[PDB]
């Protein structure tokens, strides 16, 4: 049977014509998450409820509905149930959901549950905004210069999970086919050799870049940068870059700037010129440290987006406070972006900032911008007050050490 | 015919039993490089000659021999000669060589000439040391904490150059084979889809990691860190990690630290315990900013090494002064690690620091440690004197602006 309880009071969010219809009493599924999920999720629930309560004076209220994935799912549904079918059904049915960090088992041939959720629900946009909160300790001199939004492709690239183990019958079969049927001469050592496949498609690329450009338009951003390693991977990474520029030209009236290759796209709402440009991935990892102010919206493939989002989070001292969304055409899943940190689980110690800012993204996605703004306001005030969790406090002079739950309260206090 | 002139005075370096036999008058092939190669290469030649002259009081002298690759090769050997066979022969024959940056053409289906040199000569180690020079402007607060040596695998990974263009007959053929014969269900969009292949082998992994560990032993370093994304790419990146730890156990008496997974390897020369450990790639890009002091020698695959070496160079304000070597069992090629920057070519403007420090690596590789030490000493003094090229000067208060050639002289002045 199902162990999920549909809330008595509460109504389902619907989708008509690519627009969400959010009732005053939306049911929002949430996954508590394993490890420190037990610490950060309740802090998130309280902070969100408070922002919603304050923003709309009791007129609106989320009906939270617990659903399962990860270690907790095995405890609820039994031994080998890490990702129950009903969880996929419920996220699609209720349109908007949030999760803590997840335990994926090792030794049982199971692939990342985070990636499973993204792929099964076709949540092809991994959306990671990275900004600086004044007062956050940072290893760089000018973290305030970083204000970027990463659009990471979620459905393709080496993340597809297509690979075969060295010395397996399947690997030999693939290698045999490549060498004998495809005439491949470039495998340096064809014995005891693992093999992985990297796909990149026009449709996959264009739906991702389309979203990145519409976002820049909607939020009056200054540029979209395609980041790629196309000089070495001509037909995957290079094709991503070419398809990206082509989409700009074909759907958004992009026009050559000078002799190229950059394009200008006219914001139909503000008349601002949005620059469409590109940077090679290795150079980009240097540019985000050396010239962060020159970058805004980023569009890139799965693996590059993984690396870029994490490298940027570290700049802004945001390793434990980086928000994230996974968005598709039919539903969306917001998430803590850190791991399960089991050594601290239950100690009410870790930073709930990441999952709280993903909840800020969730509220904004719902059109509840007022409540979202209150969360941003609360976060800004609490950090500026130097009333923070251990991860910040240990890097600061004369700050005040707060528990996880207490930092949640400090956010509410600063709304 | 050949347009290379073998120097009248000078003798060939030989190799016996994995040990270089370097005469007092070694012939060293060099490739000038395109674009700013014309600026940085002569500065390198002068600085090296001066260090060698001073170190050994005229007893030793390099006989430089120009050889060709890139744009200059087409001017010397004709239209489509970007990489003449003789260049590969000469680098292998003379054992040690150095190059400026290279022009690879676009639009002619030619792959990276840098990668061509590495693969054709089986230079399977890309060696990139990253340290801080006092006085260098840096975007981070504590660049002095960064002192790492990157061992980047050079012969495998997606760099192999194995891929087919979307909509090509070959791509369809591969995709057909994967779906129908291999039962692949994970290609999200199989139409208009480019495909690349990622190989990783036991032999490829182990020769790279073996070198990294022998280096840590020889240079009394504190740890070797395997960096990988093995949680997503189990059979390539994950296999690299497993093979790395296994090599440590099997060849260097690595023993479990606590419950693992880290190992300790006893330095047979100093008795120091070298830690063998591992970090996931996205987290590692955060750790190099947040905990740089915890890292020393790094061993990783081709693409990850590309990104890591560049991200680290940016930390230490070393984007134009990062040295690099490509080392195999039979020869070695030292290189400027920046591009050709054609907008400045011939202006005697850019930083020759990168190619000069690669020449420092070359001299050290030759066993000429005294001359190498003089280059390090000169570089340290010149930068500390704030007498530097435009790339440093523009980031500094009250420094003195020097031309490329003049910075070369300043290095000599500080020896
Ligand atoms: N099979 C599983 S579950 C698996 C395995 C590997 C990777 N991953 C994935 O890779 C990512 C990293 O996970 P992981 O397991 O390797 O890292 P974790 O062990 O979960 O966390 C590593 C460290 O990050 C810091 N940290 C994490 N969350 C924090 C918070 N909210 N506040 C303050 N500090 C925090 C803590 O650092 P300090 O100890 O220094 O304070 C913690 O010890 C996650 O997305 C995870 O899903 C998953
Ligand atoms: N087909 C070819 S040749 C190709 C194409 C793409 C990439 N690549 C490879 O990718 C890497 C980057 O090359 P690229 O062509 O994209 O970059 P480049 O145009 O060669 O250089 C880009 C910028 O880097 C800075 N720079 C480079 N060398 C410097 C030095 N010695 N001193 C001071 N500043 C320096 C300059 O920045 P500022 O203008 O700000 O002062 C320069 O404008 C190279 O390894 C290259 O081989 C090659
Ligand atoms: Ca990540
Ligand atoms: Ca590079």
| A254 preceded by a cis bond (ω within 30 of 0) | no
Contact in structure between B297 and B149 (CB atoms under 8 Å): yes
CA distance A67 to A61: 19
Dihedral (Cα; A245, A246, A247, A252), 10-degree rounding: 80
What angle (nearest 5°) sits at the alpha carbon of residue A357, between those of residues A352 and A361? 150
**Which value in Å is the resolution of this experimental model?**
1.8
CA distance B380 to A268: 53
What CA–CA distances, in Å, run from B144 to B74, B111, B137, B216, B279? 43, 37, 11, 20, 22
CA distance A365 to B187: 29
A282 a catalytic residue: yes
Contact in structure between A258 and A275 (CB atoms under 8 Å): no
Neighbours of A28 (CB within 10 A): 24
B159 a catalytic residue: yes
**Whether residue A114 has its Cβ less than 6 Å from ligand 1:** yes
- Decide if A159 and B194 are in contact by the 8 Å CB cutoff: no
Contact in structure between A295 and A287 (CB atoms under 8 Å): yes
CA distance A217 to A20: 19
Which ligand is nearest the CA of A351, by number? 1
CA of A386 to the centre of ligand 1 (A): 24
Residue nearest to atom 8 of ligand 1 (CA): A339
Contact in structure between B34 and B71 (CB atoms under 8 Å): yes
Contact residues on chain B for A394, CB-CB shorter than 8 A: none
| A27 preceded by a cis bond (ω within 30 of 0) | no
Three-state DSSP class for residue B357: helix
B3 marked ligand binding residue: no
What CA–CA distances, in Å, run from A130 to A51, A340, B138? 22, 21, 22
Under DSSP, the state recorded for B398 is S
Helices B404-413, B369-384: crossing angle, 10 deg rounding: 110
Three-state DSSP class for residue B340: coil
| A45 preceded by a cis bond (ω within 30 of 0) | no
Atom of ligand 2 nearest to the CA of B351: 32
CA distance B388 to B408: 10
CA distance B201 to A191: 7
Residues with CB under 6 A from ligand 2: A 231, 280; B 36, 101-104, 106, 114, 320, 338-341, 350-351, 354, 391
Q: Of B275, B387, B368, which Cα lies nearest the Cα of B52?
A: B368
Contact in structure between B115 and B159 (CB atoms under 8 Å): yes
CA distance B228 to B260: 17
- Bridge-partner residues for A63, per DSSP? A27
CA distance B407 to B403: 6
Residue nearest to atom 46 of ligand 1 (CA): A339
Under DSSP, the state recorded for B144 is G
Distance of CA A183 to the CA centre of its chain: 39
Q: Nearest by CB to A307, from B140, B170, B281: name it.
A: B281
**Whether residue A341 has its Cβ less than 6 Å from ligand 1:** yes
Neighbours of A90 (CB within 10 A): 20
SS percent in chain A: helix, strand, coil, step 5: 40, 20, 40
In terms of DSSP bridges, do strands B263-266 and B255-256 run parallel, antiparallel, or are they unpaired? antiparallel
A403 phi/psi in degrees, rounded to 5: -70, 170
User: Of how many residues is chain A composed?
Assistant: 415
> Which candidate in A49, A147, A306, A391 is catalytic?
A306
Neighbours of A400 (CB within 10 A): 12
CATH of domain B1-415: 3.40.718.10
Contact in structure between A65 and A27 (CB atoms under 8 Å): yes
B153 phi/psi in degrees, rounded to 5: -60, 130
Boundaries of every domain in chain B:
1-415
Q: And the tokens for A370?
A: 């007022």
Contact residues on chain B for A173, CB-CB shorter than 8 A: 181-182
Residue B60 half-sphere exposure toward CB, CA atoms < 13 A: 22
Contact in structure between B129 and B150 (CB atoms under 8 Å): yes
| B413 preceded by a cis bond (ω within 30 of 0) | no
In terms of DSSP bridges, do strands B325-327 and B332-335 run parallel, antiparallel, or are they unpaired? antiparallel
Radius of gyration of chain A (CA): 22
Strands, E, within A105-182: which ranges?
125-131, 147-153, 163-164
User: Of how many residues is chain B composed?
Assistant: 415
For chain A, the first-to-last Cα distance in angstroms comes to 42
Contact in structure between B171 and A161 (CB atoms under 8 Å): no
Strands, E, within B281-329: which ranges?
297-300, 325-327
Atom of ligand 2 nearest to the CA of A283: 12
What angle (nearest 5°) sits at the alpha carbon of residue A77, between those of residues A75 and A83? 95
Strands, E, within A173-251: which ranges?
193-201, 223-228
Q: And the tokens for A280?
A: 């090679």
Neighbours of A78 (CB within 10 A): 9
Minimum Cα–Cα distance from A306: chain B residue = B282
- Bridge-partner residues for A25, per DSSP? none
Q: Of B369, B350, B353, which Cα lies nearest the Cα of B361?
A: B369
CA distance B129 to B138: 17
Instruction: Enumerate residues 6+ apart whose C-beta is below 8 A from A77.
Output: A3, A68, A84
Neighbours of A220 (CB within 10 A): 11
CA distance B403 to B239: 48
For chain B, the first-to-last Cα distance in angstroms comes to 42
Contact residues on chain A for B104, CB-CB shorter than 8 A: 231
Q: And the tokens for A105?
A: 């088992």
Render A297-353 in DSSP notation, one character per residue. EEEE-HHHHHHHHHHHHHHTT-TTT---EEE-SS-EEEE--S---GGGTTSS-S--H
Q: Measured between CB atoms, does B200 come within 8 Å of chain A?
A: yes
Contact residues on chain B for A285, CB-CB shorter than 8 A: 285, 307, 310-311, 314
Contact in structure between A391 and A350 (CB atoms under 8 Å): yes
CA distance A20 to A241: 31
CA distance A172 to A167: 7
Under DSSP, the state recorded for A167 is T
Under DSSP, the state recorded for B112 is -
Contact residues on chain A for B166, CB-CB shorter than 8 A: 200-202, 235, 239
CA distance B339 to B341: 6
Q: And the tokens for B294?
A: 């915890």
Contact in structure between A161 and B186 (CB atoms under 8 Å): yes
Three-state DSSP class for residue A101: coil
- Decide if B286 and A311 are in contact by the 8 Å CB cutoff: yes
**In chain B, residues 101-120 whose CB comes closer than 8 Å to chain A:** 104, 111-112, 115, 119
Residue to probe by mutation, ligand 2, list B114, B339, B354, B359, most atoms within 8 Å of CB: B339
A159 a catalytic residue: yes
What angle (nearest 5°) sits at the alpha carbon of residue B51, between those of residues B50 and B55? 120
Radius of gyration of chain B (CA): 22
Q: Of B186, B174, B302, B175, which Cα lies nearest the Cα of B236?
A: B302
Placement of tokens 């790492």 in the chain? B148
The H or E element that residue B379 is part of is helix B369-384
CA distance B63 to chain A (A): 34
Q: Of B360, B378, B356, which Cα lies nearest the Cα of B369?
A: B360
Residue to probe by mutation, ligand 2, list A280, A282, A284, most atoms within 8 Å of CB: A280
Q: And the tokens for B208?
A: 């790279």
What angle (nearest 5°) sits at the alpha carbon of residue A119, between those of residues A103 and A7? 65
Solving technique = X-ray
- Decide if B233 and A314 are in contact by the 8 Å CB cutoff: no
A397 a catalytic residue: no
What CA–CA distances, in Å, run from A285 to A171, A213, A315, B30, B101? 33, 22, 11, 30, 20
Under DSSP, the state recorded for B177 is I
CA distance A171 to B364: 41
Render A12-69 in DSSP notation, one character per residue. --EEETTEEE--SSBEEEEE--STTHHHHHHHHHHHHHHHHHHHHTTS---EEEE---
B351 marked ligand binding residue: yes
């Amino acid at each position: 049977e199902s162990k999920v309880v549909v809330p008595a009071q509460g109504k389902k969010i619907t989708l008509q014509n690519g627009k969400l219809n959010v009732p005053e009493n939306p049911i929002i599924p949430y996954i508590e998450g394993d490890g420190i999920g037990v610490d950060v999720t309740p802090a998130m629930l309280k902070v969100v409820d408070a922002a919603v309560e304050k923003a709309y004076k009791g007129e609106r209220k989320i009906s939270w509905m617990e659903i399962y994935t990860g270690e907790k799912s095995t405890q609820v549904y039994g031994q080998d149930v890490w990702l129950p079918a009903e969880t996929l059904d419920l996220i699609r049915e209720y349109r908007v959901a949030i999760k803590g960090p997840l335990t994926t088992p090792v030794g049982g041939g199971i692939r990342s549950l985070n990636v499973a959720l993204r792929q099964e629900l076709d949540l092809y946009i991994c959306l990671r905004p990275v900004r600086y909160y004044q007062g956050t300790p940072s290893p760089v001199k000018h973290p305030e210069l970083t204000d970027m939004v990463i659009f990471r492709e979620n459905s393709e690239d080496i993340y597809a999970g297509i690979e075969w183990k060295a010395d397996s019958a399947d690997a030999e079969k693939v290698i045999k086919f490549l060498r004998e049927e495809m005439g491949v001469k470039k495998i340096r050592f064809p014995e005891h050799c693992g093999i992985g496949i990297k796909p990149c498609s026009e449709e996959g690329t264009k739906r991702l870049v389309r979203a990145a450009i519409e976002y820049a338009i909607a939020n009056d951003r200054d540029s979209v940068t395609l980041v790629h390693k196309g000089n070495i991977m001509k037909f995957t990474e290079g094709a991503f870059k070419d398809w990206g520029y082509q989409l700009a030209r074909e759907e958004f009236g992009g026009e050559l700037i000078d002799g190229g290759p950059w394009l200008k796209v006219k914001n139909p709402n503000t008349g601002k010129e949005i620059v469409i440009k590109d940077v090679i991935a290795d150079a980009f990892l240097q540019q985000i440290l050396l010239r962060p102010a020159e970058y805004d919206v980023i569009a890139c493939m799965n693996l590059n987006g993984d690396y870029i989002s994490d490298a940027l989070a570290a700049q802004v001292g945001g390793i434990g406070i980086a928000p994230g969304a996974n968005i598709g055409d039919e539903c969306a899943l917001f998430e803590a972006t850190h791991g399960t940190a089991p050594k601290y689980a239950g100690q009410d110690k870790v930073n709930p900032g990441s999952i709280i800012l993903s909840a800020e993204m969730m509220l904004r996605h719902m059109g509840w911008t007022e409540a979202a703004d209150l969360i941003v306001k609360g976060m800004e005030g609490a950090i500026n007050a130097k009333t923070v969790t251990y991860d910040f406090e240990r890097l600061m002079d004369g700050a005040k050490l707060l528990k996880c739950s207490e930092f949640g309260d400090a956010i509410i206090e600063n709304m």
